[PDB]
Design a protein around this ligand. Structure first.
Ligand SMILES: [Mg+2]
Ligand SMILES: [Mg+2]
Ligand SMILES: [Mg+2]
Ligand SMILES: [Mg+2]
Ligand SMILES: [Mg+2]
Ligand SMILES: [Mg+2]
Ligand SMILES: [Mg+2]
Ligand SMILES: [Mg+2]
Ligand SMILES: [Mg+2]
Ligand SMILES: [Mg+2]
Ligand SMILES: [Mg+2]
Ligand SMILES: [Mg+2]
Ligand SMILES: [Mg+2]
Ligand SMILES: [Mg+2]
Ligand SMILES: [Mg+2]
Ligand SMILES: [Mg+2]
Ligand SMILES: [Mg+2]
Ligand SMILES: [Mg+2]
Ligand SMILES: [Mg+2]
Ligand SMILES: [Mg+2]
Ligand SMILES: [Mg+2]
Ligand SMILES: [Mg+2]
Ligand SMILES: [Mg+2]
Lengths: 155, 129, 205, 123, 82, 80
RNA sequence: UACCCGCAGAAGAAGCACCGGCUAACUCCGUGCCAGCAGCCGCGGUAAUACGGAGGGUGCAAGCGUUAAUCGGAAUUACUGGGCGUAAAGCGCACGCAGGCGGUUUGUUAAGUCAGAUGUGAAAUCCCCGGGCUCAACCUGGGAACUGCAUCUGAUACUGG
RNA sequence: UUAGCUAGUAGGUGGGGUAACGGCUCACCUAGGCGACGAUCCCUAGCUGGUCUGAGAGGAUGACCAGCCACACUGGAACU
């Protein structure tokens, strides 16, 4: 059921008395495929240990996204640090047309029909943070009905 | 200066909502009242009141659902520096229909849906969601 | 304008049987099917996202014997057409005359079926058609013409076709050496190990 | 940024500056070799790079690279020039086309022969 | 003067004529007033081949327009089958 | 069937002629702002009744000089 | 001429770029900061998948590479869609003409704006559904579109008078 | 890193002129006309349907086809 994919692995460096210490970082995403997404970021001296720590962190820290039969409710904007993100609900049989970091988030969240675009910095950690936050603040016709005290005739 | 009283009303609402204020008061005008009407009729505010005769003051009772303000976003579209007018077929829909666009038409101030039904166009005052 | 080199090499690179041989023999008895071609065949390719997308497209192209120009035009058309681009691509390939000749069992391979088409041994609705890429429409009758009915290749191929699963969208009369393309095949009629979304992905970047 | 500011002064589109101006939007240019010599490259490289000073048909006098191992080129050699800088040779912004005009192809090349004007060996 | 004639379109060895009302001085495939029909001499005779808006052709003749020997023959052919 | 234009008298110091400015608001083709645009027209005024500042109604006619192809119809408003 | 029939025999018909990362494809030998490569980062001083040959492989294919050229990616002139404390960017400061913008009420006007009607917006091209060449390219029927302009008649909320 | 330009100039009256309106032309009269909503001067350029790219908005472009213009060795001129 849980769909998990590795987004990026980078080699970072810390300087000590006797030279550089190289460590690895792993950025991952986990999801049910029915509106649940979480990202994880792990650090370790070896690549497998880092990908593992990331997956553990990703399994918890999961959020709920109000999907509309494999697509979004409305066009949405996401922002985190240097990454500005835009997502649009597309028609049936179009697929996910997005970059790697956004595509992984949208795949595991279960968003089968998306037109996406990343502006500014394309740093994977802030791109996935901006995407997740964008999907999170996305509201349902039922939520807007509950707020307005009118329901559910938004037509 | 006080060159845009409409953007001020929206900002008074926006800031009041962010500051968890029960109500917001501002100097009144017919146009501010016409927008206050559309906001109330669409469930974005509780109720509005115009007190005074010589110096009218418009008060709006803000709406809070659960831990949050009802007005998520409220932006000025047409403004003194750049006027935005759209035809019936060019009318914008906020949040793919989940929000409202306040339009000023030949037959008064109404929502995007209302103007579309009435076959009208006009000045796009603001977007509310 | 046709791949003429060793055929089993293509199956070995894709890591699946591409039916480039008749099927008389088990693929493993003719080649090391589980190993890639060349000096570094046993090498495990830690294939990139681009690499998996490319390999899927190559696999599908190698099955039908289509080169890049005609295949990229098949995609352009699959996209232009209404509905699922991935599905439209598979239907366009499946509608090719050389493919239909193979699916009816007149040729042992798509390459044999292609030779039958080119060598003017195939008729569509009583009219001679020698274009491999010819798009066969529903209710069309593809037949081995009278002068080619005697060919031992055709008889041998219909025998091998009996050993393969029967295509639901075709009505073949083995005795007459004629068949009817009843309808376009649905996605559920074609192989599940074809990941056409990777091909749709490859042509959208 | 102001709508009023853009009405007065519209958005100015930057004009693209060419890295091959002596070509003047031509795939190649013909010229005569003025000097045929060697030059040492930039940090961190070291070599005796084969270059030529060429006077082109349009009057431009440029420096061009002579790629491959060995060349027959001397002063008064009529050569064909194409775009392409030599990263560690500042000023070198063009390449001589091997196997065209007075420029011979590279001797005994087997791989990438098209790039060095070498015809298919008889075998 | 104003003439009703054929403009040679189609392709090499497969012509397709366009019946046009035009000032005789313009080029054959050039400036025209009205498209008043078409003529396919390579038509498979199964479904269409020659179509003419005879109501507009007569309007133009009624206003002084001449007709080419080929277009006049096509009017005779359309007034023989239909 | 009477196509007409309206504007204010910019010049009257011309024998049997006047200069009229037709002002309009136009949406900027790029930046969408509504910009003021003026059209100065050399207009025929026989009898010289139109004065500087007067709002006048004008119609298009045949050429009356090298710069005049417009003539006065009525004086809409006069003396500010 | 298209096209159809007959004859003989696999016979007469495969090359080009690439394989260090970006980027699909790895080894040996030669060379030794040389000779040379290089779109960008960068390769070369004895284990060089980066030079040159070879074997193997990858990608295209009657083409393949290279150079030139436009737009894209470039939200990198940002109208849609950017910015100016320390990264490029607030004029050293003020007054102020033109210009831009302008509180609130009523009446009036109807220029902007909005609505409808009518005319026009050539054909071809693009797109859609068809038809014809064995297929395709190509040719072609009908439609859609030409998001525009103009005139006339209305609406009067907002902007202007 | 061009701010002022203009004497047939801008308008009037009458005569002439053209197929036709008109400073088109001439005599006389008035002193206008244009311009920071960019005149004048300088540089470049045939214009369009469209073409290429782009999700669009744009950007770039005006071979082949079709429409309009202009030219016909260079400068001038009329004749039919
Ligand atoms: Mg950046
Ligand atoms: Mg080809
Ligand atoms: Mg690789
Ligand atoms: Mg190389
Ligand atoms: Mg070595
Ligand atoms: Mg380029
Ligand atoms: Mg741009
Ligand atoms: Mg910036
Ligand atoms: Mg400080
Ligand atoms: Mg600074
Ligand atoms: Mg300061
Ligand atoms: Mg009234
Ligand atoms: Mg048209
Ligand atoms: Mg057909
Ligand atoms: Mg057509
Ligand atoms: Mg038509
Ligand atoms: Mg008013
Ligand atoms: Mg006169
Ligand atoms: Mg010129
Ligand atoms: Mg020519
Ligand atoms: Mg032309
Ligand atoms: Mg002429
Ligand atoms: Mg002359």
């Amino acid at each position: 059921e849980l769909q998990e994919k590795l987004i990026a692995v980078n080699r970072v460096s810390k300087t000590v008395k006797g030279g550089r210490i190289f460590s690895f970082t792993a950025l991952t995403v986990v999801g049910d495929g029915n509106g649940r997404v979480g990202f994880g970021y792990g650090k370790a001296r070896e690549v497998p240990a880092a990908i593992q720590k990331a997956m553990e962190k990703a399994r918890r820290n999961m959020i709920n996204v109000a999907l509309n039969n494999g697509t979004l409710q409305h066009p949405v904007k996401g922002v985190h640090t240097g990454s500005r993100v835009f997502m649009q609900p597309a028609s049936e049989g179009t697929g996910i047309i997005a970059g790697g970091a956004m595509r992984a988030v949208l795949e595991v969240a279960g968003v089968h029909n998306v037109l996406a675009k990343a502006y500014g910095s394309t740093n994977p950690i802030n791109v996935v943070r901006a995407t997740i936050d964008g999907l999170e603040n996305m509201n349902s016709p039922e939520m807007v009905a509950a707020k307005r005290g009118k329901s559910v005739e938004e037509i | 200066s006080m060159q845009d009283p409409i953007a001020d009303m929206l900002t008074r609402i926006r800031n009041g909502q962010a500051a968890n204020k029960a109500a917001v008061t501002m100097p009144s005008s017919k146009l501010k009242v016409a927008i206050a009407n559309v906001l109330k009729e669409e469930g974005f505010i509780e109720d509005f009141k115009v007190e005074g005769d010589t110096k009218p003051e418009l008060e709006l009772t803000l709406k809070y659902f659960q831990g949050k303000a009802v007005v998520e976003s409220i932006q000025r579209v047409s403004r003194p520096g750049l006027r935005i007018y759209k035809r019936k077929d060019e009318l914008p829909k906020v949040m793919a229909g989940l929000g409202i666009a306040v339009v000023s038409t030949s037959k008064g101030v109404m929502t995007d849906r209302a103007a579309r039904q009435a076959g009208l166009g006009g000045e796009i005052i603001c977007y509310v969601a | 304008a046709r791949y003429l080199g060793p055929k089993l090499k293509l199956s070995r690179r894709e890591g699946t049987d591409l039916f480039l041989k008749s099927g008389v023999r088990a693929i493993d008895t003719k080649c090391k099917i589980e190993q890639a071609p060349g000096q570094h065949g046993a090498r495990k390719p830690r294939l990139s996202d681009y690499g998996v997308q490319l390999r899927e497209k190559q696999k599908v192209r190698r099955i039908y014997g289509v080169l890049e120009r005609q295949f990229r035009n098949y995609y352009k058309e699959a996209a232009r057409l209404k509905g699922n681009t991935g599905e439209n691509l598979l239907a366009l390939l499946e509608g090719r005359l050389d493919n239909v000749v193979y699916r009816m069992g007149f040729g042992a391979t798509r390459a044999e079926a292609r030779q039958l088409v080119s060598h003017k041994a195939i008729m569509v609705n009583g009219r001679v058609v020698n274009i491999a890429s010819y798009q066969v429409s529903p209710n069309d009758v593809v037949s081995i013409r009278e002068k080619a009915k005697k060919q031992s290749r055709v008889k041998a191929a219909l025998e091998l076709a009996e050993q393969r699963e029967k295509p639901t969208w075709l009505e073949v009369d083995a005795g007459k050496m004629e068949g009817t393309f009843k309808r376009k095949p649905e996605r559920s009629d074609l192989s599940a190990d074809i990941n056409e979304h990777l091909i749709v992905e490859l042509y959208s970047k | 940024a102001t709508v009023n500011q853009l009405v007065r002064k519209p958005r100015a589109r930057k004009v693209a500056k060419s890295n091959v101006p002596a070509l003047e939007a031509c795939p190649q240019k013909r010229g005569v070799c003025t000097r045929v010599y060697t030059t040492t490259p930039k940090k961190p490289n070291s070599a005796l790079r084969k270059v030529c000073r060429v006077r082109l048909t349009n009057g431009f006098e440029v420096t061009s690279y002579i790629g491959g191992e060995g060349h027959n080129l001397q002063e008064h050699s009529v050569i064909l020039i194409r775009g392409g800088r030599v990263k560690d040779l500042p000023g070198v912004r063009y390449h001589t086309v091997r196997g065209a005009l007075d420029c011979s192809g590279v001797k005994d090349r087997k791989q990438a022969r098209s790039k060095y004007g070498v015809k298919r060996p008889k075998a | 003067m104003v003439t009703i004639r054929l403009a040679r379109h189609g392709a090499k060895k497969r012509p397709f004529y366009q019946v046009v009302v035009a000032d005789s001085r313009n080029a054959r495939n050039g400036r025209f007033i009205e498209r008043v029909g078409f003529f396919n001499p390579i038509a498979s005779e199964k479904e269409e081949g020659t179509r003419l808006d005879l109501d507009r052709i007569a309007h133009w003749v009624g206003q002084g327009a001449t007709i080419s020997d080929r277009v006049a023959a096509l009017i005779k052919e359309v007034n023989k089958a239909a | 069937k009477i196509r007409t234009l309206q504007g204010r008298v910019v010049s009257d110091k011309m024998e049997k002629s006047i200069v009229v400015a037709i002002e309009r608001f136009v949406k900027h083709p790029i930046y969408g702002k509504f910009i003021k645009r003026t059209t100065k027209l050399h207009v025929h005024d026989e009898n010289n009744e139109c004065g500087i500042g007067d709002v006048v109604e004008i119609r298009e006619c045949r050429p009356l000089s090298k710069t005049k192809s417009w003539t006065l119809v009525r004086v809409v408003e006069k003396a500010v």
